[PDB]
Write a protein that binds this ligand. Structure first.
Ligand SMILES: Nc1ncc(-c2ccnc(N3CCOCC3)n2)cn1
Length: 843
């Protein structure tokens, strides 16, 4: 019954569900019950047009955001038509019959199926089209070229191989749903005319010269008043008085505490932050016990205002007891109507052009005090340039309820903005729940499932910035994960991979419980993925701890011996790939598995593809399992590279990049996708500057030589511009790879935000004066055009990095690290001045 489901949920999260039942925090138990509404809404969407809607949840169409094909992709077609191969399995003997078609690139799946039926019968709608070799279906009326698989075949010049499948054969393999409910289911702040005061009672569990408590009232990372310290001494029993009146406290105000140690040398020993208002909008009052957190490396200040809000779950840590005033009644933050009343009671063409100039500045551009006052005075004209909302929100004095009431009214009527601009309002700079709610509404209105999958790692990270467990953002993400299994799969893994981090364990564990309770039979597939990953984690841990010093041959004897055990073989075969759940990982080809001699000794694993038409895609799936490397920098880099490639493709610049798959599975463990038929530059050379070009010529003889040199040039141009803008380091010949067809790509992105002679000879087709050929001038023009196209999209890139500021990545800890892109992109210069800077760097 439910005891079975709770056991399976526990195995998926890596935490027994009864641990959440034991938590007495009312916010936790209210979240567990209230999130079930989102679960029921999603389950209802899945049964609305059953069984078609159930099939589209499990197998959502993998399409691009727009049906429009860029001019250079349309040119690859034959008079706007594509040649596709439709296969039909005609049992007995499982015989494969192919029928080749030449149809319009925008033909919907049913038109393609009808043309195949016509060609077959020359010797109605109870069929569906599947991609040969993987579990990807064409279940929706999109034009064929919009499907990522088809669009990928047009570019690349490959032939689409689709399979005509009986609609009944798919629907019968979909499970029967249940999603049954679990067993676990005043005065106004503005009338308190006193300044804020908080009593610091005593600190337990605090085993140099003296100790004191450092405190501050903050809104985001910005202090609303000066910091106040207790006396150096531990019992203080002292009331701390702040230079801020209670009615001027914004809704997202937080108390940031610290226990510091003392030409005096100061150092934080522990920190803790408390929301001044709880999840029910009640101002905190009475006694409270805050368990503090250890100081994170590289703090550079006495307080941590960006850090997680709430008491440390480990109650055997420094515990600071605090007392808040009680004003005889429960104090609440005023209703929207009350705020509206106070906002009302609070009240040139050269100026319109000055607002337009400020509006075009990037998120990290400095806005002077004169400019902040200028923007705020024209706050009413600003509703006509909606892209200026983030700049106007920074101009508001958040410690003044008169300005904040007026800002709330402007936000309540603000025109919707594009998702990439609404995402800037979801970083740590904008804590206000009305600002954050506006941003989420822009995402619900305009974010496609495609763009949501693309920006999933920033949206899962910005969940950590929410003040409360139940919020608009988490409800949006969970609804999208519970209505699109491809989004849900990555949503599950992005959360699970952070369960080891205790500052987020509770939030992410509760969110994972809701997801597992409502995802349906996919939980059984997720448990197989989790079980295979645990066997690999334990195995690689035994290798890196016990058999660490033994030889590679002795380690391989142990790996084969461990992997041949029944328990291990069953766990490592017949499960979906966490890198791409559309790929089934059948039988382990142990003869092809090897312990690599690369850093941290990763495992190169090879599994058969059990698809009946595996030969039309890939017969074997090769994945690297790594233990010891933080795959988060690689994830972020590969996401940026994919975004840069789309910016170039859509602007008509055909620069082909290779953002191979890379999923973090937990604490410094992950999977990396093996790009088939690839070799490092060092391998090509060790099997002189003219060696590389010679290897490419031996592999590509004839007309296919021109294609390989062109592809090499384009891919090389994209990676020179990308590595430049991002400041990617350690670009030696073992981190740069090349494919049989000339495609160049980089690997291992351990360094970010800080052209060999062999490539120039390949680009110039063999010439000795390579830097003087016309091919080098054409390659140089590609770089300049690629550089300027990305510079036009700088606000997107600055925002995608800014959302990663609180991930804990050593390379991105502050806005000074993101400022590296402001220098390479030369955002403080003109388009002509930036191109000349880039040209000087290239020359
Ligand atoms: N973090 C990180 N990322 C990638 C690697 C790595 C090392 C060796 N080979 C590959 N390749 C094989 C060819 O396909 C592309 C992936 N990757 C290592 N560490």
């Amino acid at each position: 019954e439910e005891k079975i489901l709770n056991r399976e949920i526990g195995f998926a999260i890596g935490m027994p569900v009864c641990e959440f039942d034991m938590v007495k925090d009312p916010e936790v138990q209210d979240f567990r019950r209230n999130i079930l509404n989102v679960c029921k809404e999603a389950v209802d969407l899945r049964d609305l047009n059953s069984p078609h809607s159930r099939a589209m949840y499990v197998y959502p169409p993998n399409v691009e955001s727009s049906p429009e094909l860029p001019k250079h992709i349309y040119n690859k077609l034959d008079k706007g038509q594509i040649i596709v191969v439709i296969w039909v399995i005609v049992s007995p003997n499982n015989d494969k019959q192919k029928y080749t078609l030449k149809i319009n690139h925008d033909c919907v799946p049913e038109q393609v199926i009808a043309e195949a039926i016509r060609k077959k019968t020359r010797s109605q709608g109870k069929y569906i089209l599947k991609v040969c070799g993987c579990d990807e279906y064409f279940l929706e009326k999109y034009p064929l070229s919009q499907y990522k698989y088809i669009r990928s075949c047009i570019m690349l010049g490959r032939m689409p191989n689709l399979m005509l499948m009986a609609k009944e054969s798919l629907y019968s393999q979909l499970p029967m749903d249940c999603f049954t409910m679990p067993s676990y289911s005043t005065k106004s702040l503005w009338v308190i005319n006193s300044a804020l005061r908080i009593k610091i009672l005593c600190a337990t569990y605090v085993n140099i010269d003296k100790i004191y408590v450092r405190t501050g009232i903050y809104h985001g990372g910005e202090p609303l008043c000066d910091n106040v310290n207790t006396q150096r001494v531990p019992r203080w029993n002292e009331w701390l008085n702040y230079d801020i009146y209670i009615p001027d406290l914004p809704r997202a105000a937080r108390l940031c505490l610290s226990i510091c140690s003392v030409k005096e040398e100061h150092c934080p020993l522990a920190w803790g932050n408390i929301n001044l208002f709880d999840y029910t909008d009640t101002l905190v009052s009475g006694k409270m016990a805050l368990n503090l957190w250890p100081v994170p490396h590289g703090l550079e200040d006495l307080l941590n205002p960006i850090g997680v809000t709430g008491s440390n779950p480990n109650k055997e840590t420094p515990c600071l007891e605090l007392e808040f005033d009680w004003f005889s009644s429960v104090v609440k933050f005023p209703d929207m109507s009350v705020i509206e009343e106070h906002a009302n009671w609070s009240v040139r063409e050269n100026d319109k052009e000055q607002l337009k100039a400020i509006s075009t500045r990037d998120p990290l551009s400095e806005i002077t005090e004169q400019e902040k006052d200028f923007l705020w005075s024209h706050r009413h004209y600003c509703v006509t340039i909606p892209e200026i909302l983030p700049k106007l929100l920074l101009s508001v004095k958040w410690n003044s309820r008169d300005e904040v009431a007026q800002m709330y009214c402007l936000v309540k009527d603000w025109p919707p903005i594009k998702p990439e601009q609404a995402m800037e309002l979801l970083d740590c700079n904008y804590p206000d729940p009305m600002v954050r709610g506006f941003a989420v509404r822009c995402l619900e209105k305009y974010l496609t499932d495609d763009k949501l999958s693309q920006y999933l790692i920033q949206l899962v990270q910005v969940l950590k910035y929410e003040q409360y467990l139940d919020n608009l953002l988490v409800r949006f993400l969970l609804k999208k994960a519970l209505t699109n299994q491809r989004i849900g799969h990555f949503f599950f893994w992005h959360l699970k991979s952070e369960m080891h981090n205790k500052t987020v364990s509770q939030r992410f564990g509760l969110l994972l419980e809701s997801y597992c309770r409502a995802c349906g039979m996919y939980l059984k597939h997720l448990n197989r993925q989790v079980e295979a990953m645990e066997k690999l984690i334990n195995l690689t841990d035994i290798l890196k701890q016990e058999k660490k010093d033994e030889t590679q041959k002795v380690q391989m004897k142990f790996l084969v011996e461990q992997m041949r055990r029944p328990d291990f073989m069953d766990a490592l075969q017949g499960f979906l790939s966490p890198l791409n759940p559309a790929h089934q990982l059948g039988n382990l080809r142990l003869e092809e598995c090897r312990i690599m001699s690369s850093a941290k000794r990763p495992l190169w694993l090879n599994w058969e593809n059990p698809d009946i038409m595996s030969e039309l895609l890939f017969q074997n799936n090769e994945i690297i399992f790594k233990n010891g490397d933080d795959l988060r920098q690689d994830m972020l880099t590969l996401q940026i590279i994919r975004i840069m490639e789309n910016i170039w493709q859509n602007q008509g610049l055909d620069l082909r990049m290779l953002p191979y798959g890379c999923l973090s599975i937990g604490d410094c463990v992950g999977l990396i996708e093996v790009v088939r038929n690839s070799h490092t530059i060092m391998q090509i050379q060790c099997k002189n500057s003219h060696t590389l070009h010679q290897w490419l010529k031996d592999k590509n003889k004839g007309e296919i030589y021109d294609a390989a040199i062109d592809l090499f040039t384009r891919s090389c141009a994209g990676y020179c511009v990308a590595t430049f803008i991002l400041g990617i380091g350690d670009r030696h010949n073992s981190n740069i790879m090349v494919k049989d067809d000339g495609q160049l790509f980089h690997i291992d992105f351990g360094h970010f935000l800080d052209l060999t002679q062999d490539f120039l000879i390949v680009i110039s087709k063999g010439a000795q004066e390579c830097t003087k050929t016309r091919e080098f001038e054409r390659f140089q023009e590609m770089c300049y055009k690629a550089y300027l196209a990305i510079r036009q999209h700088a606000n997107l890139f600055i925002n995608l990095f800014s959302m990663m500021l609180g991930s804990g990545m050593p390379e991105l800890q502050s806005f000074d690290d993101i400022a590296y892109i402001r220098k390479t992109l030369a955002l403080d210069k003109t388009e002509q001045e930036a191109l000349e800077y880039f040209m000087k760097q290239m020359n």
